[PDB]
Coordinates of C-alpha atoms and ligand atoms in Angstrom, one line a residue:
Chain A
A82 CA 0.0 0.1 0.1
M83 CA 1.1 3.8 0.2
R84 CA 4.0 4.7 2.1
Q85 CA 4.0 8.1 3.8
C86 CA 7.2 9.8 3.9
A87 CA 8.7 13.1 4.4
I88 CA 12.3 14.4 3.5
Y89 CA 13.3 16.7 6.8
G90 CA 16.5 19.0 6.7
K91 CA 17.7 22.5 7.1
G92 CA 17.2 25.1 4.2
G93 CA 19.8 26.1 1.8
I94 CA 21.5 22.6 1.2
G95 CA 19.8 21.8 -2.0
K96 CA 16.9 19.8 -0.4
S97 CA 14.3 20.6 -2.3
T98 CA 15.9 19.7 -5.3
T99 CA 16.8 16.4 -4.0
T100 CA 13.6 15.5 -3.1
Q101 CA 11.9 16.2 -6.6
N102 CA 15.0 14.4 -8.4
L103 CA 14.5 11.3 -6.2
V104 CA 10.4 11.3 -6.7
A105 CA 11.3 12.0 -10.4
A106 CA 13.5 8.6 -10.3
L107 CA 10.8 6.8 -8.4
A108 CA 7.9 7.9 -10.9
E109 CA 10.5 7.0 -13.6
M110 CA 10.5 3.5 -12.2
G111 CA 6.9 3.3 -12.1
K112 CA 5.8 4.6 -9.0
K113 CA 2.8 7.2 -8.1
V114 CA 4.1 9.8 -5.9
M115 CA 2.9 12.9 -4.4
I116 CA 4.7 15.6 -2.8
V117 CA 3.5 18.0 -0.3
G118 CA 5.9 20.9 -0.2
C119 CA 5.8 22.3 3.1
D120 CA 8.4 25.4 3.0
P121 CA 6.4 28.8 3.7
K122 CA 8.5 29.9 0.5
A123 CA 7.1 27.1 -1.9
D124 CA 9.9 25.6 -3.8
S125 CA 9.4 21.7 -3.7
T126 CA 7.4 21.3 -6.9
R127 CA 8.5 23.6 -9.5
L128 CA 11.0 21.0 -11.0
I129 CA 8.5 18.4 -11.3
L130 CA 5.8 21.0 -12.9
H131 CA 8.2 23.2 -14.9
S132 CA 6.5 25.9 -13.1
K133 CA 7.2 29.6 -12.0
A134 CA 5.6 29.5 -8.6
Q135 CA 2.9 26.7 -7.6
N136 CA 0.1 28.4 -6.1
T137 CA -0.3 27.2 -2.3
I138 CA -3.3 26.0 -0.4
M139 CA -2.7 28.9 2.0
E140 CA -2.6 32.0 -0.7
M141 CA -5.7 30.3 -2.1
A142 CA -7.6 29.8 1.4
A143 CA -7.1 33.9 1.7
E144 CA -8.9 34.4 -1.5
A145 CA -12.4 32.7 -1.7
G146 CA -12.5 33.3 2.2
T147 CA -11.7 30.0 3.4
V148 CA -10.3 26.5 2.9
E149 CA -14.0 25.3 2.5
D150 CA -14.3 26.6 -1.2
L151 CA -11.2 25.5 -2.4
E152 CA -11.3 22.9 -5.3
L153 CA -8.6 20.0 -5.6
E154 CA -7.9 20.5 -9.3
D155 CA -6.7 24.0 -8.3
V156 CA -4.4 22.5 -5.3
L157 CA -3.1 19.3 -6.8
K158 CA -1.3 19.6 -10.2
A159 CA 0.2 16.8 -11.8
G160 CA 3.7 16.8 -13.5
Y161 CA 6.5 14.5 -15.0
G162 CA 6.1 10.8 -14.8
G163 CA 2.5 11.7 -13.3
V164 CA 4.1 12.9 -9.8
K165 CA 1.3 14.7 -8.0
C166 CA 2.2 17.9 -6.4
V167 CA 0.7 20.8 -3.6
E168 CA 2.2 23.5 -2.0
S169 CA 1.2 24.1 1.7
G170 CA 2.4 27.5 1.9
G171 CA 2.6 29.4 5.2
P172 CA 1.2 32.5 7.3
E173 CA 2.4 35.9 6.8
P174 CA 6.0 36.6 8.3
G175 CA 5.6 36.9 12.0
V176 CA 2.1 36.2 12.6
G177 CA 1.7 33.0 14.3
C178 CA 3.7 29.8 13.5
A179 CA 5.4 29.9 10.4
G180 CA 4.8 26.3 9.4
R181 CA 1.3 25.9 10.0
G182 CA 0.3 25.7 6.3
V183 CA 1.2 21.9 6.7
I184 CA -2.2 21.3 9.1
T185 CA -4.2 23.3 6.8
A186 CA -2.7 21.2 3.7
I187 CA -3.0 17.4 5.3
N188 CA -6.6 18.5 6.4
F189 CA -7.7 19.3 3.3
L190 CA -5.8 16.6 1.1
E191 CA -7.4 14.2 3.6
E192 CA -10.9 15.4 3.1
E193 CA -10.6 15.1 -0.5
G194 CA -9.7 11.6 -0.4
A195 CA -6.1 12.7 -2.2
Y196 CA -4.1 9.7 -0.3
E197 CA -6.6 7.2 -2.2
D198 CA -6.5 8.0 -5.7
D199 CA -3.7 5.7 -6.7
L200 CA -0.3 6.4 -4.7
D201 CA 2.6 4.4 -3.7
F202 CA 4.5 7.4 -2.2
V203 CA 3.6 10.7 -0.2
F204 CA 6.6 12.9 0.5
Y205 CA 6.3 15.9 2.8
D206 CA 9.1 18.2 1.9
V207 CA 9.6 20.0 5.2
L208 CA 12.0 22.4 6.7
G209 CA 14.1 21.5 9.9
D210 CA 15.8 24.9 10.8
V211 CA 13.2 24.4 13.8
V212 CA 11.4 21.5 14.8
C213 CA 8.2 22.4 16.4
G214 CA 4.7 23.6 15.9
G215 CA 3.8 23.0 12.3
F216 CA 7.3 21.9 11.6
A217 CA 7.2 18.9 13.8
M218 CA 3.4 18.1 12.5
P219 CA 4.0 15.5 10.1
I220 CA 6.0 13.6 13.2
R221 CA 3.7 14.5 15.8
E222 CA 0.2 13.7 14.3
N223 CA 2.2 10.6 12.7
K224 CA 1.1 11.7 9.1
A225 CA 4.7 10.2 7.9
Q226 CA 6.2 7.1 8.9
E227 CA 9.5 7.5 7.2
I228 CA 11.7 10.0 7.8
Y229 CA 14.8 10.6 5.7
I230 CA 17.0 13.5 6.6
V231 CA 19.1 15.5 4.1
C232 CA 22.2 17.2 5.5
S233 CA 25.7 18.1 4.7
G234 CA 29.2 18.0 6.3
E235 CA 28.5 21.2 7.9
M236 CA 27.6 22.1 11.4
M237 CA 24.3 23.3 11.5
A238 CA 23.4 20.6 9.1
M239 CA 24.2 18.0 11.1
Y240 CA 22.8 19.9 14.2
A241 CA 19.3 20.1 12.2
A242 CA 19.3 16.2 11.7
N243 CA 20.4 15.7 15.4
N244 CA 16.9 17.5 16.6
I245 CA 15.1 15.9 14.0
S246 CA 16.4 13.0 15.2
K247 CA 15.1 14.2 18.6
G248 CA 11.8 14.9 17.6
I249 CA 11.2 11.2 16.2
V250 CA 12.5 10.0 19.8
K251 CA 9.8 12.3 21.4
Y252 CA 7.1 10.9 19.3
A253 CA 8.1 7.0 19.6
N254 CA 5.5 5.7 21.3
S255 CA 3.3 8.1 19.9
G256 CA 3.0 6.4 16.1
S257 CA 5.4 4.7 14.0
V258 CA 7.2 7.5 12.8
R259 CA 10.8 6.2 12.3
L260 CA 14.1 7.2 10.6
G261 CA 14.8 5.7 7.6
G262 CA 18.4 7.3 7.3
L263 CA 20.8 10.6 6.3
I264 CA 20.9 11.7 2.6
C265 CA 24.4 13.6 2.1
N266 CA 23.8 16.7 -0.2
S267 CA 27.7 16.9 -0.9
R268 CA 29.0 20.4 -1.0
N269 CA 32.0 19.2 -2.3
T270 CA 33.9 18.9 0.7
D271 CA 36.7 16.6 1.7
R272 CA 35.8 13.4 3.3
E273 CA 32.1 14.5 3.5
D274 CA 30.7 10.9 2.4
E275 CA 32.8 9.7 5.4
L276 CA 31.4 12.3 7.9
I277 CA 28.0 11.3 7.4
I278 CA 28.5 7.7 7.2
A279 CA 30.0 8.4 10.8
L280 CA 27.0 10.3 12.3
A281 CA 24.2 8.2 10.6
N282 CA 26.2 5.5 12.5
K283 CA 26.2 7.3 15.5
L284 CA 22.7 8.1 15.5
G285 CA 21.5 4.3 14.8
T286 CA 20.9 4.7 11.1
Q287 CA 22.7 4.6 7.6
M288 CA 23.7 7.4 5.1
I289 CA 21.3 5.9 2.6
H290 CA 22.9 7.7 -0.4
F291 CA 25.6 10.6 -1.1
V292 CA 24.5 12.5 -3.7
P293 CA 27.6 14.1 -5.3
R294 CA 27.6 18.1 -6.4
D295 CA 27.7 18.1 -10.5
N296 CA 26.5 20.9 -12.6
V297 CA 24.1 18.8 -14.7
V298 CA 22.0 19.6 -11.7
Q299 CA 21.9 23.4 -12.3
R300 CA 21.5 22.7 -16.1
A301 CA 18.8 20.9 -15.1
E302 CA 17.4 23.5 -12.6
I303 CA 17.7 26.5 -15.0
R304 CA 15.2 24.7 -17.1
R305 CA 12.9 24.0 -14.4
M306 CA 13.6 20.1 -14.4
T307 CA 15.0 17.3 -12.6
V308 CA 18.2 15.6 -14.0
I309 CA 15.9 12.3 -14.5
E310 CA 13.9 14.4 -17.2
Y311 CA 16.5 16.8 -18.4
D312 CA 19.2 14.0 -18.9
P313 CA 18.5 10.7 -18.4
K314 CA 22.0 9.2 -19.8
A315 CA 23.8 11.5 -17.1
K316 CA 26.0 9.8 -14.6
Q317 CA 23.9 12.0 -12.2
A318 CA 20.5 10.5 -13.1
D319 CA 22.1 7.2 -11.7
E320 CA 22.9 8.5 -8.5
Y321 CA 18.9 9.6 -8.1
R322 CA 18.1 6.2 -9.4
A323 CA 20.3 4.5 -6.7
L324 CA 18.7 6.4 -4.1
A325 CA 15.2 5.8 -5.0
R326 CA 16.1 1.8 -5.0
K327 CA 16.9 2.1 -1.7
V328 CA 14.7 4.0 -0.3
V329 CA 12.2 1.9 -2.1
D330 CA 13.8 -1.4 -0.4
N331 CA 14.9 0.1 2.9
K332 CA 14.1 -2.1 5.8
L333 CA 15.7 0.2 8.3
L334 CA 13.4 2.2 10.3
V335 CA 14.7 3.0 13.6
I336 CA 14.5 4.9 16.6
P337 CA 17.4 7.1 16.4
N338 CA 19.8 7.9 19.2
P339 CA 20.7 11.5 19.2
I340 CA 24.2 12.5 20.0
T341 CA 25.7 15.6 22.4
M342 CA 27.2 18.7 20.6
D343 CA 30.3 17.3 22.0
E344 CA 30.2 14.3 20.0
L345 CA 28.9 16.4 16.8
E346 CA 32.3 18.5 17.4
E347 CA 34.3 15.4 17.6
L348 CA 33.0 13.8 14.1
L349 CA 33.9 17.2 12.6
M350 CA 37.2 17.7 14.1
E351 CA 38.1 14.1 13.3
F352 CA 37.0 14.4 9.6
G353 CA 38.8 18.0 8.9
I354 CA 36.2 20.5 9.1
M355 CA 36.6 21.5 12.6
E356 CA 40.1 22.4 14.2
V357 CA 41.5 21.0 17.2
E358 CA 40.7 23.5 20.2
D359 CA 44.3 24.9 20.8
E360 CA 44.4 25.9 24.8
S361 CA 47.4 28.4 25.3
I362 CA 45.9 30.6 22.7
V363 CA 42.6 31.1 24.4
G364 CA 41.1 33.8 26.5
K365 CA 44.3 36.2 26.3
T366 CA 44.6 36.4 22.3
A367 CA 47.3 39.2 21.7
Chain B
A255 CA 17.7 56.9 27.6
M256 CA 18.4 52.9 27.1
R257 CA 18.2 52.0 23.6
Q258 CA 16.7 48.7 23.0
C259 CA 17.7 46.9 19.3
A260 CA 17.9 43.6 17.8
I261 CA 20.4 42.1 15.1
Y262 CA 17.9 39.8 13.2
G263 CA 19.7 37.5 10.3
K264 CA 19.8 34.4 8.8
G265 CA 22.4 31.9 10.5
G266 CA 25.4 30.8 9.2
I267 CA 27.0 34.1 7.8
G268 CA 28.7 35.4 10.8
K269 CA 25.5 37.5 12.1
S270 CA 26.6 37.0 16.3
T271 CA 30.4 37.1 15.6
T272 CA 29.2 40.7 14.4
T273 CA 27.1 41.5 16.8
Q274 CA 29.4 40.9 19.2
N275 CA 32.2 42.7 17.6
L276 CA 29.9 45.7 17.3
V277 CA 28.8 45.2 20.8
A278 CA 32.5 45.4 21.9
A279 CA 33.4 48.2 19.8
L280 CA 30.4 49.9 21.5
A281 CA 32.1 48.9 25.2
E282 CA 35.1 50.4 24.2
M283 CA 33.5 53.5 23.3
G284 CA 32.4 53.6 27.3
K285 CA 28.7 52.3 26.4
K286 CA 27.1 50.1 28.9
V287 CA 25.8 47.2 26.8
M288 CA 23.7 44.0 27.5
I289 CA 23.8 41.0 25.0
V290 CA 20.5 38.8 25.1
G291 CA 21.3 35.9 22.8
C292 CA 17.8 34.5 21.6
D293 CA 19.4 31.8 19.3
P294 CA 18.6 28.0 20.8
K295 CA 22.5 27.1 19.9
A296 CA 23.2 30.1 21.9
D297 CA 26.1 31.5 20.5
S298 CA 25.4 35.1 20.9
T299 CA 27.9 35.6 23.9
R300 CA 31.0 33.6 23.7
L301 CA 33.2 36.1 22.6
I302 CA 32.4 38.1 25.1
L303 CA 32.8 35.7 27.7
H304 CA 35.8 33.9 26.4
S305 CA 33.5 30.8 27.0
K306 CA 33.0 27.6 25.1
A307 CA 29.0 28.0 25.7
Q308 CA 26.9 30.2 28.4
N309 CA 24.4 28.8 30.4
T310 CA 21.0 29.4 29.4
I311 CA 17.7 30.1 31.4
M312 CA 16.0 27.2 29.5
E313 CA 18.5 24.5 30.9
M314 CA 18.5 26.1 34.6
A315 CA 14.8 26.5 34.1
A316 CA 15.0 22.8 34.1
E317 CA 16.9 22.7 37.2
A318 CA 15.1 24.5 39.8
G319 CA 11.8 24.1 37.5
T320 CA 10.3 27.5 37.9
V321 CA 10.6 29.9 35.2
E322 CA 12.1 32.7 38.1
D323 CA 14.4 31.5 40.3
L324 CA 17.9 33.0 38.9
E325 CA 19.7 35.8 40.2
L326 CA 21.8 37.3 37.8
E327 CA 25.2 35.6 38.6
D328 CA 24.7 32.1 37.1
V329 CA 22.1 33.6 34.6
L330 CA 23.7 37.1 33.7
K331 CA 27.5 37.2 33.7
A332 CA 29.1 40.4 32.8
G333 CA 32.1 39.8 30.5
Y334 CA 34.7 42.1 28.5
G335 CA 34.0 45.9 28.7
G336 CA 31.7 45.2 31.2
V337 CA 28.9 44.2 28.5
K338 CA 26.4 41.8 30.3
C339 CA 26.0 38.6 28.2
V340 CA 22.8 36.5 28.4
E341 CA 21.2 33.4 26.8
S342 CA 17.7 32.5 26.1
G343 CA 18.3 28.9 24.9
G344 CA 15.2 27.5 23.5
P345 CA 13.0 24.3 24.7
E346 CA 13.5 20.7 23.5
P347 CA 12.7 20.1 20.2
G348 CA 8.8 19.4 19.6
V349 CA 8.3 20.9 23.0
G350 CA 6.1 23.9 22.5
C351 CA 7.0 26.7 20.5
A352 CA 11.0 27.3 20.1
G353 CA 10.7 30.9 21.3
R354 CA 9.4 29.9 24.6
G355 CA 13.2 30.4 25.6
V356 CA 13.1 34.1 24.4
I357 CA 9.6 34.9 25.8
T358 CA 10.7 33.7 29.0
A359 CA 14.3 35.6 29.1
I360 CA 12.4 38.8 28.8
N361 CA 9.8 39.1 31.6
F362 CA 12.6 37.4 33.8
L363 CA 14.7 40.3 33.0
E364 CA 12.3 42.8 33.4
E365 CA 11.4 41.4 36.7
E366 CA 14.8 41.8 38.0
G367 CA 14.5 45.4 36.0
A368 CA 18.1 44.5 34.6
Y369 CA 17.0 46.7 31.8
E370 CA 16.7 49.5 34.2
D371 CA 20.6 48.5 36.1
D372 CA 23.0 51.4 34.3
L373 CA 22.3 50.5 30.4
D374 CA 22.8 52.6 27.2
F375 CA 22.1 49.8 24.9
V376 CA 20.5 46.3 25.0
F377 CA 21.1 44.0 21.8
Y378 CA 18.8 40.8 21.4
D379 CA 20.8 38.4 19.0
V380 CA 17.9 36.5 17.1
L381 CA 17.9 34.3 14.1
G382 CA 16.0 35.1 11.2
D383 CA 15.9 31.8 9.0
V384 CA 12.1 31.5 10.5
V385 CA 10.3 34.3 11.1
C386 CA 7.3 33.5 13.5
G387 CA 5.2 34.7 16.2
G388 CA 7.9 32.7 18.2
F389 CA 11.2 34.8 17.0
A390 CA 9.1 37.7 16.1
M391 CA 8.1 38.3 19.4
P392 CA 10.7 41.1 20.9
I393 CA 9.4 42.7 17.7
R394 CA 5.8 42.1 18.3
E395 CA 5.8 42.7 22.3
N396 CA 7.6 46.1 21.3
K397 CA 10.4 44.9 23.2
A398 CA 12.8 45.9 20.3
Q399 CA 12.5 49.3 19.0
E400 CA 15.8 49.5 16.7
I401 CA 16.3 46.7 14.1
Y402 CA 19.6 45.9 12.4
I403 CA 19.6 43.2 9.9
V404 CA 22.6 41.5 8.9
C405 CA 22.7 39.7 5.5
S406 CA 24.8 38.8 2.5
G407 CA 24.6 38.9 -0.9
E408 CA 23.0 35.7 -1.1
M409 CA 19.2 34.5 -2.0
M410 CA 18.3 33.3 1.5
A411 CA 19.9 36.0 3.5
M412 CA 18.3 38.4 1.4
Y413 CA 15.2 36.5 1.5
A414 CA 15.6 36.9 5.4
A415 CA 16.0 40.5 5.3
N416 CA 13.0 41.1 3.5
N417 CA 10.7 38.8 5.9
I418 CA 12.1 40.7 8.8
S419 CA 11.0 43.7 7.0
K420 CA 7.2 42.3 6.6
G421 CA 7.3 41.5 10.1
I422 CA 8.7 45.2 10.9
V423 CA 5.9 46.8 8.7
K424 CA 3.0 44.5 10.5
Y425 CA 4.1 46.2 14.0
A426 CA 5.2 49.4 12.9
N427 CA 1.8 51.1 13.9
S428 CA 0.9 49.2 17.1
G429 CA 4.4 50.3 18.3
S430 CA 7.9 52.1 17.6
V431 CA 9.9 49.3 15.8
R432 CA 11.6 50.5 13.0
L433 CA 14.3 49.2 10.6
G434 CA 17.8 51.1 11.3
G435 CA 19.5 49.4 8.5
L436 CA 21.0 46.4 6.6
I437 CA 24.7 45.1 7.6
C438 CA 26.1 43.4 5.3
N439 CA 29.1 40.8 6.5
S440 CA 30.9 40.1 2.9
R441 CA 31.1 36.2 2.0
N442 CA 33.7 37.2 -0.9
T443 CA 31.0 37.3 -3.6
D444 CA 31.5 40.0 -6.3
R445 CA 29.3 43.1 -6.1
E446 CA 28.1 42.0 -2.8
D447 CA 28.3 45.5 -1.2
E448 CA 26.6 47.1 -4.2
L449 CA 23.9 44.2 -4.0
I450 CA 22.9 45.2 -0.3
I451 CA 22.7 49.1 -1.2
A452 CA 20.5 48.2 -3.8
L453 CA 18.7 46.0 -1.5
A454 CA 18.7 49.0 1.1
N455 CA 17.6 51.3 -1.4
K456 CA 14.8 49.2 -2.4
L457 CA 13.7 48.7 1.0
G458 CA 13.8 52.3 1.6
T459 CA 16.3 51.6 4.2
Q460 CA 20.2 51.8 4.4
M461 CA 23.3 49.7 3.8
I462 CA 24.5 51.3 7.7
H463 CA 27.9 49.2 6.8
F464 CA 29.9 46.8 4.9
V465 CA 31.5 44.5 7.5
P466 CA 34.5 42.7 5.2
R467 CA 36.1 39.3 5.8
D468 CA 39.5 39.5 7.7
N469 CA 41.0 36.6 8.9
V470 CA 41.5 38.4 12.0
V471 CA 38.2 37.5 12.8
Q472 CA 38.6 33.9 12.3
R473 CA 41.6 34.4 14.6
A474 CA 39.9 36.3 17.2
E475 CA 37.5 33.7 17.1
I476 CA 39.4 30.9 17.9
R477 CA 40.5 32.7 20.9
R478 CA 37.2 33.0 22.2
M479 CA 36.5 36.4 21.3
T480 CA 36.3 39.4 19.4
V481 CA 38.5 41.5 17.1
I482 CA 38.2 44.4 19.3
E483 CA 39.8 42.8 22.3
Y484 CA 42.1 40.6 20.3
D485 CA 43.9 43.2 18.6
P486 CA 42.1 46.6 18.7
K487 CA 45.0 47.7 16.6
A488 CA 43.5 45.7 13.6
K489 CA 42.2 47.3 10.3
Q490 CA 39.1 45.1 11.1
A491 CA 38.9 46.6 14.3
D492 CA 38.2 50.1 13.0
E493 CA 35.2 48.8 10.7
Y494 CA 33.5 47.7 13.6
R495 CA 34.4 51.3 15.4
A496 CA 32.8 52.8 12.3
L497 CA 29.5 50.8 12.4
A498 CA 29.3 51.1 16.3
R499 CA 29.6 55.1 15.9
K500 CA 26.8 54.9 12.7
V501 CA 24.6 52.8 14.9
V502 CA 25.2 55.2 17.8
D503 CA 24.3 58.2 15.7
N504 CA 21.5 56.8 13.4
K505 CA 19.0 59.3 13.1
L506 CA 17.3 56.9 10.1
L507 CA 14.7 54.7 11.8
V508 CA 12.4 53.8 8.7
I509 CA 9.2 51.6 8.2
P510 CA 10.7 49.2 5.6
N511 CA 8.8 48.7 2.1
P512 CA 9.4 45.1 1.5
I513 CA 9.9 43.4 -2.4
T514 CA 8.0 41.5 -3.8
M515 CA 9.8 37.7 -5.3
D516 CA 10.2 39.0 -8.5
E517 CA 11.9 42.2 -7.4
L518 CA 14.2 40.4 -5.5
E519 CA 15.1 38.0 -7.7
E520 CA 15.5 40.9 -10.4
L521 CA 18.0 42.2 -8.2
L522 CA 19.8 38.9 -7.9
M523 CA 19.8 38.6 -11.5
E524 CA 21.2 42.1 -12.2
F525 CA 24.2 41.8 -10.0
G526 CA 25.5 38.4 -11.8
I527 CA 24.1 36.1 -9.0
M528 CA 21.0 34.4 -10.2
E529 CA 20.9 32.9 -13.8
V530 CA 18.7 34.8 -16.6
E531 CA 16.4 32.1 -17.5
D532 CA 16.1 31.4 -20.9
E533 CA 12.3 30.8 -21.9
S534 CA 12.8 29.0 -24.9
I535 CA 14.5 26.1 -23.6
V536 CA 12.4 25.6 -20.7
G537 CA 11.3 22.0 -20.2
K538 CA 13.3 20.6 -23.1
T539 CA 15.5 17.5 -22.8
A540 CA 19.2 17.9 -23.4
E541 CA 18.6 15.9 -26.5
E542 CA 16.3 18.0 -27.8
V543 CA 17.9 21.5 -27.5
Ligands
SF4_231 S1 6.3 26.6 17.1 FE1 8.5 27.1 16.0 S2 7.8 27.7 13.9 FE2 6.1 27.8 15.1 S3 6.0 30.0 16.0 FE3 6.9 28.8 17.5 S4 9.3 29.1 17.3 FE4 8.4 29.7 15.6

């Protein structure tokens, strides 16, 4: 039947691009997928739809008075491989919870039966700069059971994974939401794959795939398309295909073991990222 | 006339180092300052204390278990230049609003009237990756009147600056929140300064200062300190003194005019940051065209 998944991760590391490329490979693979973007910014579906900006449930809800009038064919658009797409949107900056649009989107897609009309996978593309309120909603309310975290060999990207992992632990007994693995969005750093393999193993999970940097990505993106649709013969298309296959066959769905800041700093030092703390040099620079 | 300000900015671009070096320069100027870090991670005060990490309210509100119970000795540590350094901390991921650490910290400080105890400036150091009721609090409750936005010539940093501006807009009437200007932390991008100047102009504000990249910052950072206390005779040290004096003497506090996504992307394109889309090849595979 359908598997409800979610790709979580900090902003600015190529997450939405990795999600849409993984989803296109799934669709190329024969799977029927729906992406539910949850970033207030709404940039989780444009490569599937070759679009400027998809109209968000929130923008619309603010138009015909409320979300009761909203039509499903106006909210959900289909694109490459038949992948269905919806954007939650979000409130105006500073007004309430920035990630609440998800609750509005999920509740609407529910009433409209969207989740039963031929779907093998549902992927919520959620931000993880903070894990609270609307952002933690797909986990809290047991809306996505298979969580895959996008990260890179950088402090903040790693910190976010840890806190998201924390969020999963907190709702452990709450449902069947579990961590399926870390996806490394390479930032062309030395020993980056090793660094994430190191953290995933420390978390009690797996680095399900290391996504290399490759210009073909931007060449595909400038045309509002995924690498799978733009250049199927490319080396990078295979990478997304590999990820897709492992996600499809994934069996490792665990309750993570959140590390501590010191461990975090340990991996970073250990892998050529952070420098070992000199000591005579502190407190009284000169 | 104690001035309450806030430095907002996207994370990952040295904002806190700028806030701290800014406050240090201010301190050297003989100004009495206090930094309220409102970042979950809590790195808004290390450089001032020469610490690895300062204890937050949240953490020690989970020791005594009750919001109020921490004389400013264990919670409010004064460090370099007499700058009082405090940290809000945040709650556990999934435990209520992450802005609980902020909303807490202030009331607590207003309860000890730490604001009234010999102070010229208070700077809340807040992250702008998420502009929601939780983190817009200082603005919303009228806790911070003078806002300064740290940004760089990059998409998210400028997007974050526009969103902070939207939040300033929203409350410009209920209180006296105003945007003092943009602070560009250079990330070594061409035309970065001119891009931010341009953005300042569009937003209807000013780029109060361009903070350059100087390895003496990373140098003094390792020492767990500011560039000011480190080597006050550094060329970079003078950039903070300059920014500081413009902050002290800033008359220009305005209500920002946010721009649309087009205007922003427009800006980004004319400065060579964002690629101009070729309409014809959109949705065509590499073999087709
Ligand atoms: S729960 Fe988080 S995203 Fe929501 S308003 Fe609070 S701090 Fe912001």
